[PDB]
Amino acid sequence: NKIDKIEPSDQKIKEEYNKFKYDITKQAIESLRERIPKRIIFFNNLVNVNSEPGSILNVNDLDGVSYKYKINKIDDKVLYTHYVPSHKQIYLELEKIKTYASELIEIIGNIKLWIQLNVPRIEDGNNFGVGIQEEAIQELARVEESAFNLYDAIVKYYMERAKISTKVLKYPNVSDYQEAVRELDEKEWIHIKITIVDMRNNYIMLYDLLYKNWEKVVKPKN
Amino acid sequence: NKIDKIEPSDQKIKEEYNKFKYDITKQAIESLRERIPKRIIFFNNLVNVNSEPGSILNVNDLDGVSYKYKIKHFSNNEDSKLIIDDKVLYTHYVPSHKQIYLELEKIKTYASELIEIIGNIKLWIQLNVPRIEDGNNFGVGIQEEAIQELARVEESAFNLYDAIVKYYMERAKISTKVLKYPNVSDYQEAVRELDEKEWIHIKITIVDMRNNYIMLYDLLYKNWEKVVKPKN
Amino acid sequence: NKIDKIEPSDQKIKEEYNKFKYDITKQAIESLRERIPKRIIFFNNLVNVNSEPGSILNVNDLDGVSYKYKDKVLYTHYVPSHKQIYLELEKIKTYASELIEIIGNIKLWIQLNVPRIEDGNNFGVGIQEEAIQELARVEESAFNLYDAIVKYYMERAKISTKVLKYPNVSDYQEAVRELDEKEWIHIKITIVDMRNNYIMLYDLLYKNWEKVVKPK
Amino acid sequence: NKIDKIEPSDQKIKEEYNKFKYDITKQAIESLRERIPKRIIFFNNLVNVNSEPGSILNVNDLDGVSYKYKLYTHYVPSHKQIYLELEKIKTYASELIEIIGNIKLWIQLNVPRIEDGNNFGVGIQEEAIQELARVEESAFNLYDAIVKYYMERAKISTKVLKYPNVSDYQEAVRELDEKEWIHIKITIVDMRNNYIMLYDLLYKNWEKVVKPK
Amino acid sequence: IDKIEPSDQKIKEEYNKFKYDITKQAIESLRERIPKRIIFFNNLVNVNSEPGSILNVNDLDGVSYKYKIKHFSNNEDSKLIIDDKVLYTHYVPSHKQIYLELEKIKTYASELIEIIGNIKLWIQLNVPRIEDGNNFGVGIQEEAIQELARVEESAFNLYDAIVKYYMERAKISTKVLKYPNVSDYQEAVRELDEKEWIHIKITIVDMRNNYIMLYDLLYKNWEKVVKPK
Amino acid sequence: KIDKIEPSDQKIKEEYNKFKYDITKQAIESLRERIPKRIIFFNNLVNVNSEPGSILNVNDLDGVSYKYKITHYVPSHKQIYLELEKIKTYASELIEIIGNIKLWIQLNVPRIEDGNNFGVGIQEEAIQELARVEESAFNLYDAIVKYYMERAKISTKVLKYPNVSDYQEAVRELDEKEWIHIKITIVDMRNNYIMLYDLLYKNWEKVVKPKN
Amino acid sequence: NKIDKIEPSDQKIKEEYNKFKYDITKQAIESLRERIPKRIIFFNNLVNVNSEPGSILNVNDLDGVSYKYKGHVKHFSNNEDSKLIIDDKVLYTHYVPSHKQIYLELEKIKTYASELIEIIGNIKLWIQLNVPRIEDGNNFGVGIQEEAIQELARVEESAFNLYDAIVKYYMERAKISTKVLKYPNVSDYQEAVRELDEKEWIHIKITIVDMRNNYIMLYDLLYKNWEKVVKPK
């Protein structure tokens, strides 16, 4: 009543699948030999490890005047007596953050998939090297998950900033609402810079982790 | 009060039941030999592993202009406030993202077929769990691990249907805020970001399809001997 | 510190109680020999395992035009309910009602079959607990369907309220459509989970029947 | 650092205290020999185990027309039928809480002095107290759940008045009533089944519940 | 330096007196205060009562304190505009019967926290130096403190719950005024009062039963609570 | 590279060592004097010898002077305000005293080694209780803001519904709750000081030298 | 399936990578030998351990009168403390200032938190880079390394949350001030503003102590376990 072999029946698909496992290995090795070290230097050029404290995580280049509450005393924000514009400077920086996050997820996802495809058949005993594989997969997914949540967090920034702006329009002299907008912008600005450092450091620990344990990641058994 | 057989009494049902267990095994084997490999190539053809970094998870092909706030019902009164049927009424038009709609429809298709295929492979293994015994059940642990990984992918795809309703609800809510507060520019940026978020989530969903289909296939292929006969 | 035996004092009650334990066992065996297998085949006929992928969990047979935004007062804002989904939801509740009755009595019978607590040689009693737990999970799972149905109508009503207030904000109308499409899928997934739960319970009891009845 | 016995000082209270321990034991035994079997047959007569599937948990006896939404004012009445059925539930739950609490307390009063080893029978006692407390807490939550029904039904009814043509709000009232109707009957079955498993559990492990050592 | 006895000798004595005074109060509670309260609460909810004679609602006034479809005597049952804000003159009385019963509940809870609190503290102060092994009696001490703390914390939450009753009753009563056509809002007030009435009585039983299981627990394991080693 | 991490600046090394000396000084001073003084102090406010119900009562609570008045305002409970200020003082001094005793024990955990570190568990047990009481006192500042915010909300409802009496009963019950909560806090102060002191005193030998 | 070495192909990249690992070690050692002890004494100078009880966590230096409701910029100067109709919507000209004293103190907190995040991240990364190749057995010292990394991340996340709490302060103060404008008859709303400011003043000072204590607890942890943190094998 049964056959118990599950090789793909279509021989053309069987080759395309095997070509796929080859192509991943290329991308995985390629990321480790070229892409990732270059990205380490890239983010380091943005947040140099040798910087003195407070020279990275500061708020001095943050424009606190161009994008605050304004009064007016084929169109735009001119038919209204008071508007509250968005922080274009933070917008431009957030756009860069998403690019760093996308390219990270692509790179990490294929390296993680490659290690998963290298996990051997489950057996009893002598699978200490498999734990190393699992630790690497775990750390890769953790970094990947962290970058994935950035896209949703950015929508929350605009939604939260907009809510406060409505309150500023209703209570334009209650100053704590305006300080809240400023503080929201300053917080997002700091979070952006901490994200960039996390990029730099994550690429480094992931590269260092895989490099040290490369022999067990590839051949986890004898 | 001491009978110890519970085979179905109806011989027609006994036949229909046994045929059902056969059909499961049949469909499960077919999914592994053809349906899954075909989809591995399919999704890879959509998000190729050989793509250059940033060429998959980008937003360059997302129309960010055709479906933003503009300045059909109630054709006589455009962009106005009405009092109709004793209630307040906004004849302000804010369109949906026709581009995202078409992509979201395809996602549900990928999710539907995944639940059907993965669920049956999971069901087949579950129905293949042996009688509970003490000891010598290491192979049962392999069965449980496979069922867990199969169930995780299945549940992840199942959550997509509910999440899509939230996209339209969330997009609709913010658009109301743009209509009430055209001065708060962040409400317009929030709509813009929401579409960008959904566009990225769509593409990451497709990659997860590709990768889940392969690791599940690769996992089952490697442990196939213990998944079928966990004790002999 | 007086007398320490507790058989029911009224002898007529003792008979009705013993009769009750007989009536459960009959119903429990009957559920395993006929009621559950008959229902497994029924739900499979609704979501057949032999269907091509996507032909089960789809939305092709869902009417998406008859019940969208278009008598009691001299009104203009009328928004009907999805009569097609209503009929399917009514069928779901019967499936859930019949499940709780069938599974609950099988569970009670197994509970009544747990022996006196003793130390050791109770591996089969652990099997009994697994069966009772799995039966209770399926019972609890089906039980929550009634509340989920109330939420569907409530959620559809709120969105429909939003469509009346913002008749040109198109995403509110998409949200109604997607809500109905979601329920249509959930209805079918509910039927699959019914089918799969009944058989996994049946397969579980069948394989371990000896330890379920005589764990010692 | 003075005196190390804590027997009650008042001899009249000491007598009343022991009488209470006697009265508990009496009530508990009476509950197991008469009160619980009597209710098992009682609840079974309301939800007979021999009923065909769906004949218990149905909605056929639920009035779905008398209590729906009605110059012209418009009111929304309560489901007087569900009111009537919910009142009985609170009666069933109250009598259960009274009965189980004293049986649970009696076993608690029968838990021995803590010793090392040979306290396997105490585990039987603990298991029994756990199940009694579980059933008691389950019945206790019914009073708060009933207030939510009226609160929830009132909320939806407000929406029907505000949006009298959005029919899903009217379906929500109907569905809520059908949900409460089903929950009522599931509660009655849970009563029957709880009384039986509690009685069956105590009967089987009676020797260790009374003499754990 | 490695000794930390108090430098002030008057303080050092007062501290020893306090440990003595606690031991005094705890024993008094076990010998007199607790048994008296066991009988007291039992006289309120006698164990010999037939089922339903305790947890019923027959003695609850459900008619005197419902909304009748005093300040601002000129405009009765009306909506006003004062200081540019909305004003409702509508009168809705409080449930005076439940108020009197709740006041007693707070008294029972206050006396419980004081009595149970000192017994718990006394046992805690009797925990020996932490050592490895031969600490089976310390587990008994820990078990007693846990049950003592559970009863104490349970009673402590009653003060907060009583505020919620008045807040919830007022909220629903507000809805009855806004929606006199929604009959379920009127049913909700009734059920809330019936719920509080039942909860009050179950609280009284829990007082009775907690006093007994606590007294029985300490008496049976008294030897290990004082000399766990 | 190089494998020493003594502070490079010789001036900092002295300033740092003086700090660790000052910590030990303050912690011992707290255990020998500050804490026992607090035990007697709080006991004199909630005497253990009090008859039941004489502590946790509401008899001394002014419940009429600060109710809804008559154009209509709603005043604050000045009596509770004065008692809340004292509560904050007790909590501040507690955090300061307990924090240094906790910090000193944390600074006294030895170098990590494998096995024969039963005494380190005692240190951890002591730190856990010290932090628990400190965290409990820390939340008092936030809880006080909630009192006024909650009281103001109810008073807002009383102004909107001046004849719905349950809203007025809610104000009264809130004040009575805060009055009781204040006193339970003082007892918890008294009891925590003793349980911490008694715990440290009994296990003092292992708290200081957990390994010999 | 070919070669299983993944050294960077460009020798130039290997130099910047190796230079980077050296530059971290420099920064980490510099932080442990100089930066952190300096910070310990600094925060101690703000909340001195030798202070008598209640002299630190008090409210005596808090201006609670200058900024309550009767460097900002008053708007709608023609209509003061009134309701207006602007862009067909509701508007309250009412002026309610911020607490400049709390503002200045919060600005200092953010610098303390930023410099902490910068310092801790490099020490943590350095230890992460110093965790050896995974091997079976003799990895008791790696547990020390992991424990050290764990505590470093806890402190780093703790400081990170200060920025959001500061946004919450202003939002909370603004809402209550809104209530004071609507209900000047409810005296408890005015007390809530006062208590909110008093709460933040205390939280500011407790934050500074938590800084001080975390810097020393991290330094004390690394100093005592230095041999196993660097060479666990």
PDB file of C-alpha atoms in Angstrom, chain F residues 44-206:
ATOM      1  CA  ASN F  44       5.205  53.765  68.376  1.00  0.00           C
ATOM      2  CA  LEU F  45       2.861  54.725  65.498  1.00  0.00           C
ATOM      3  CA  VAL F  46       1.347  51.239  65.087  1.00  0.00           C
ATOM      4  CA  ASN F  47       1.940  49.546  68.421  1.00  0.00           C
ATOM      5  CA  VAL F  48       1.961  45.756  68.330  1.00  0.00           C
ATOM      6  CA  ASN F  49       0.176  45.791  71.707  1.00  0.00           C
ATOM      7  CA  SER F  50      -2.794  47.658  70.209  1.00  0.00           C
ATOM      8  CA  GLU F  51      -6.168  45.970  70.485  1.00  0.00           C
ATOM      9  CA  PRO F  52      -7.550  44.575  67.203  1.00  0.00           C
ATOM     10  CA  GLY F  53      -9.182  47.212  65.025  1.00  0.00           C
ATOM     11  CA  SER F  54      -7.490  50.069  66.909  1.00  0.00           C
ATOM     12  CA  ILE F  55      -4.802  50.419  64.208  1.00  0.00           C
ATOM     13  CA  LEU F  56      -6.606  49.623  60.958  1.00  0.00           C
ATOM     14  CA  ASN F  57      -9.606  51.827  61.586  1.00  0.00           C
ATOM     15  CA  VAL F  58     -11.028  55.007  60.091  1.00  0.00           C
ATOM     16  CA  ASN F  59     -12.253  56.726  63.247  1.00  0.00           C
ATOM     17  CA  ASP F  60      -9.696  59.554  63.128  1.00  0.00           C
ATOM     18  CA  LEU F  61     -10.377  60.237  59.428  1.00  0.00           C
ATOM     19  CA  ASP F  62     -12.126  63.535  58.711  1.00  0.00           C
ATOM     20  CA  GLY F  63     -14.842  62.427  56.304  1.00  0.00           C
ATOM     21  CA  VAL F  64     -17.042  65.518  56.114  1.00  0.00           C
ATOM     22  CA  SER F  65     -14.753  68.541  55.794  1.00  0.00           C
ATOM     23  CA  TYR F  66     -13.513  67.648  52.291  1.00  0.00           C
ATOM     24  CA  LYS F  67     -16.659  66.337  50.584  1.00  0.00           C
ATOM     25  CA  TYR F  68     -18.481  68.072  47.737  1.00  0.00           C
ATOM     26  CA  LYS F  69     -19.229  71.709  48.623  1.00  0.00           C
ATOM     27  CA  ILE F  70     -21.389  74.583  47.358  1.00  0.00           C
ATOM     28  CA  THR F  71     -20.200  77.611  41.898  1.00  0.00           C
ATOM     29  CA  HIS F  72     -19.409  74.188  43.357  1.00  0.00           C
ATOM     30  CA  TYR F  73     -15.796  73.136  43.977  1.00  0.00           C
ATOM     31  CA  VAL F  74     -14.343  69.881  45.302  1.00  0.00           C
ATOM     32  CA  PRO F  75     -11.512  70.318  47.831  1.00  0.00           C
ATOM     33  CA  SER F  76      -8.539  68.079  48.469  1.00  0.00           C
ATOM     34  CA  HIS F  77      -8.254  65.927  51.580  1.00  0.00           C
ATOM     35  CA  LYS F  78      -5.746  68.019  53.503  1.00  0.00           C
ATOM     36  CA  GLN F  79      -5.533  65.444  56.305  1.00  0.00           C
ATOM     37  CA  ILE F  80      -4.578  62.665  53.896  1.00  0.00           C
ATOM     38  CA  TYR F  81      -2.214  65.058  52.128  1.00  0.00           C
ATOM     39  CA  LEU F  82      -0.260  65.620  55.346  1.00  0.00           C
ATOM     40  CA  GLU F  83      -0.077  61.890  56.019  1.00  0.00           C
ATOM     41  CA  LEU F  84       0.986  61.142  52.448  1.00  0.00           C
ATOM     42  CA  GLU F  85       3.933  63.529  52.792  1.00  0.00           C
ATOM     43  CA  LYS F  86       5.178  61.601  55.831  1.00  0.00           C
ATOM     44  CA  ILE F  87       4.789  58.328  53.928  1.00  0.00           C
ATOM     45  CA  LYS F  88       7.067  59.678  51.198  1.00  0.00           C
ATOM     46  CA  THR F  89       9.650  60.600  53.833  1.00  0.00           C
ATOM     47  CA  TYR F  90       9.633  57.103  55.317  1.00  0.00           C
ATOM     48  CA  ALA F  91      10.023  55.656  51.823  1.00  0.00           C
ATOM     49  CA  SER F  92      12.878  57.961  50.810  1.00  0.00           C
ATOM     50  CA  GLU F  93      14.889  57.188  53.944  1.00  0.00           C
ATOM     51  CA  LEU F  94      14.147  53.486  53.438  1.00  0.00           C
ATOM     52  CA  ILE F  95      15.424  53.464  49.853  1.00  0.00           C
ATOM     53  CA  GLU F  96      18.585  55.284  50.931  1.00  0.00           C
ATOM     54  CA  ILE F  97      19.273  52.977  53.881  1.00  0.00           C
ATOM     55  CA  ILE F  98      18.332  49.696  52.191  1.00  0.00           C
ATOM     56  CA  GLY F  99      20.057  50.621  48.930  1.00  0.00           C
ATOM     57  CA  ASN F 100      23.454  51.005  50.597  1.00  0.00           C
ATOM     58  CA  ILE F 101      23.066  47.831  52.646  1.00  0.00           C
ATOM     59  CA  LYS F 102      22.095  46.048  49.429  1.00  0.00           C
ATOM     60  CA  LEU F 103      24.911  47.661  47.439  1.00  0.00           C
ATOM     61  CA  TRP F 104      27.474  46.723  50.089  1.00  0.00           C
ATOM     62  CA  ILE F 105      26.446  43.054  50.011  1.00  0.00           C
ATOM     63  CA  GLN F 106      26.513  43.083  46.213  1.00  0.00           C
ATOM     64  CA  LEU F 107      30.022  44.563  46.318  1.00  0.00           C
ATOM     65  CA  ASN F 108      30.974  41.732  48.715  1.00  0.00           C
ATOM     66  CA  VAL F 109      30.185  38.774  46.431  1.00  0.00           C
ATOM     67  CA  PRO F 110      33.487  36.930  45.859  1.00  0.00           C
ATOM     68  CA  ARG F 111      35.136  35.961  42.608  1.00  0.00           C
ATOM     69  CA  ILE F 112      33.111  33.277  40.831  1.00  0.00           C
ATOM     70  CA  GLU F 113      34.456  29.768  41.427  1.00  0.00           C
ATOM     71  CA  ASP F 114      32.965  26.316  40.880  1.00  0.00           C
ATOM     72  CA  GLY F 115      31.328  24.731  43.909  1.00  0.00           C
ATOM     73  CA  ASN F 116      31.556  25.207  47.671  1.00  0.00           C
ATOM     74  CA  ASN F 117      29.748  28.542  47.334  1.00  0.00           C
ATOM     75  CA  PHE F 118      26.764  27.842  49.576  1.00  0.00           C
ATOM     76  CA  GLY F 119      27.338  31.154  51.353  1.00  0.00           C
ATOM     77  CA  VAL F 120      26.910  33.119  48.127  1.00  0.00           C
ATOM     78  CA  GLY F 121      23.334  31.835  48.015  1.00  0.00           C
ATOM     79  CA  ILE F 122      22.784  33.411  51.432  1.00  0.00           C
ATOM     80  CA  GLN F 123      24.095  36.713  50.062  1.00  0.00           C
ATOM     81  CA  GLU F 124      21.720  36.365  47.114  1.00  0.00           C
ATOM     82  CA  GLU F 125      18.839  35.512  49.457  1.00  0.00           C
ATOM     83  CA  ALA F 126      19.604  38.623  51.518  1.00  0.00           C
ATOM     84  CA  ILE F 127      19.936  40.862  48.444  1.00  0.00           C
ATOM     85  CA  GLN F 128      16.620  39.535  47.132  1.00  0.00           C
ATOM     86  CA  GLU F 129      14.712  40.542  50.273  1.00  0.00           C
ATOM     87  CA  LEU F 130      16.542  43.869  50.456  1.00  0.00           C
ATOM     88  CA  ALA F 131      15.582  44.655  46.864  1.00  0.00           C
ATOM     89  CA  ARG F 132      11.992  43.482  47.386  1.00  0.00           C
ATOM     90  CA  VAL F 133      11.366  45.940  50.220  1.00  0.00           C
ATOM     91  CA  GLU F 134      13.147  48.687  48.273  1.00  0.00           C
ATOM     92  CA  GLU F 135      11.062  48.065  45.146  1.00  0.00           C
ATOM     93  CA  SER F 136       7.922  48.045  47.298  1.00  0.00           C
ATOM     94  CA  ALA F 137       8.754  51.437  48.804  1.00  0.00           C
ATOM     95  CA  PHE F 138       9.769  52.843  45.410  1.00  0.00           C
ATOM     96  CA  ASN F 139       6.289  52.353  43.960  1.00  0.00           C
ATOM     97  CA  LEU F 140       4.758  54.550  46.665  1.00  0.00           C
ATOM     98  CA  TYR F 141       5.675  57.747  44.818  1.00  0.00           C
ATOM     99  CA  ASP F 142       3.825  56.598  41.706  1.00  0.00           C
ATOM    100  CA  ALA F 143       0.849  55.331  43.713  1.00  0.00           C
ATOM    101  CA  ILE F 144       0.336  58.763  45.287  1.00  0.00           C
ATOM    102  CA  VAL F 145      -0.070  60.444  41.893  1.00  0.00           C
ATOM    103  CA  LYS F 146      -2.771  57.876  41.138  1.00  0.00           C
ATOM    104  CA  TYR F 147      -4.692  58.767  44.313  1.00  0.00           C
ATOM    105  CA  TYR F 148      -5.193  62.404  43.331  1.00  0.00           C
ATOM    106  CA  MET F 149      -5.800  61.492  39.697  1.00  0.00           C
ATOM    107  CA  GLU F 150      -8.401  58.909  40.697  1.00  0.00           C
ATOM    108  CA  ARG F 151      -9.973  61.252  43.252  1.00  0.00           C
ATOM    109  CA  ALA F 152     -10.144  64.050  40.687  1.00  0.00           C
ATOM    110  CA  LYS F 153     -11.809  61.795  38.119  1.00  0.00           C
ATOM    111  CA  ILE F 154     -14.543  60.767  40.558  1.00  0.00           C
ATOM    112  CA  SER F 155     -15.009  64.377  41.657  1.00  0.00           C
ATOM    113  CA  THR F 156     -15.444  65.225  37.979  1.00  0.00           C
ATOM    114  CA  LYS F 157     -18.281  62.698  37.814  1.00  0.00           C
ATOM    115  CA  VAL F 158     -19.841  64.129  40.984  1.00  0.00           C
ATOM    116  CA  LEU F 159     -19.923  67.545  39.328  1.00  0.00           C
ATOM    117  CA  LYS F 160     -21.602  66.056  36.252  1.00  0.00           C
ATOM    118  CA  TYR F 161     -24.027  63.879  38.274  1.00  0.00           C
ATOM    119  CA  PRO F 162     -24.394  65.667  41.631  1.00  0.00           C
ATOM    120  CA  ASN F 163     -27.402  63.534  42.612  1.00  0.00           C
ATOM    121  CA  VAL F 164     -26.005  60.101  41.657  1.00  0.00           C
ATOM    122  CA  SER F 165     -24.978  59.282  45.221  1.00  0.00           C
ATOM    123  CA  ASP F 166     -22.725  56.318  44.417  1.00  0.00           C
ATOM    124  CA  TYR F 167     -20.202  58.695  42.846  1.00  0.00           C
ATOM    125  CA  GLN F 168     -20.129  60.583  46.139  1.00  0.00           C
ATOM    126  CA  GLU F 169     -19.845  57.301  48.033  1.00  0.00           C
ATOM    127  CA  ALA F 170     -16.907  56.396  45.781  1.00  0.00           C
ATOM    128  CA  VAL F 171     -14.978  59.496  46.877  1.00  0.00           C
ATOM    129  CA  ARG F 172     -15.514  58.623  50.536  1.00  0.00           C
ATOM    130  CA  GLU F 173     -14.503  54.992  50.024  1.00  0.00           C
ATOM    131  CA  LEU F 174     -11.381  56.027  48.113  1.00  0.00           C
ATOM    132  CA  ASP F 175     -10.254  58.225  51.012  1.00  0.00           C
ATOM    133  CA  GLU F 176     -10.995  55.474  53.534  1.00  0.00           C
ATOM    134  CA  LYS F 177      -8.983  53.064  51.388  1.00  0.00           C
ATOM    135  CA  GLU F 178      -6.026  55.445  51.200  1.00  0.00           C
ATOM    136  CA  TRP F 179      -6.276  55.979  54.954  1.00  0.00           C
ATOM    137  CA  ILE F 180      -6.126  52.218  55.509  1.00  0.00           C
ATOM    138  CA  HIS F 181      -3.409  51.783  52.871  1.00  0.00           C
ATOM    139  CA  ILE F 182      -1.343  54.464  54.622  1.00  0.00           C
ATOM    140  CA  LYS F 183      -1.485  52.567  57.912  1.00  0.00           C
ATOM    141  CA  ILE F 184      -0.791  49.175  56.336  1.00  0.00           C
ATOM    142  CA  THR F 185       2.251  50.800  54.722  1.00  0.00           C
ATOM    143  CA  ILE F 186       3.517  51.991  58.122  1.00  0.00           C
ATOM    144  CA  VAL F 187       3.078  48.495  59.562  1.00  0.00           C
ATOM    145  CA  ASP F 188       4.862  47.074  56.521  1.00  0.00           C
ATOM    146  CA  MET F 189       7.627  49.597  57.204  1.00  0.00           C
ATOM    147  CA  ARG F 190       7.874  48.468  60.832  1.00  0.00           C
ATOM    148  CA  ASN F 191       7.693  44.780  59.926  1.00  0.00           C
ATOM    149  CA  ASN F 192      10.146  45.003  57.015  1.00  0.00           C
ATOM    150  CA  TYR F 193      12.811  46.725  59.122  1.00  0.00           C
ATOM    151  CA  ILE F 194      12.625  43.898  61.663  1.00  0.00           C
ATOM    152  CA  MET F 195      12.531  41.057  59.136  1.00  0.00           C
ATOM    153  CA  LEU F 196      15.510  42.552  57.292  1.00  0.00           C
ATOM    154  CA  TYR F 197      17.469  43.201  60.489  1.00  0.00           C
ATOM    155  CA  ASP F 198      16.623  39.787  61.934  1.00  0.00           C
ATOM    156  CA  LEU F 199      17.563  38.108  58.649  1.00  0.00           C
ATOM    157  CA  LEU F 200      20.914  39.892  58.357  1.00  0.00           C
ATOM    158  CA  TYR F 201      21.738  39.450  62.054  1.00  0.00           C
ATOM    159  CA  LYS F 202      21.187  35.691  61.989  1.00  0.00           C
ATOM    160  CA  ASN F 203      23.149  35.178  58.749  1.00  0.00           C
ATOM    161  CA  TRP F 204      25.709  37.947  59.318  1.00  0.00           C
ATOM    162  CA  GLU F 205      28.683  35.576  59.425  1.00  0.00           C
ATOM    163  CA  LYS F 206      27.956  34.241  55.925  1.00  0.00           C
TER     164      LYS F 206
END
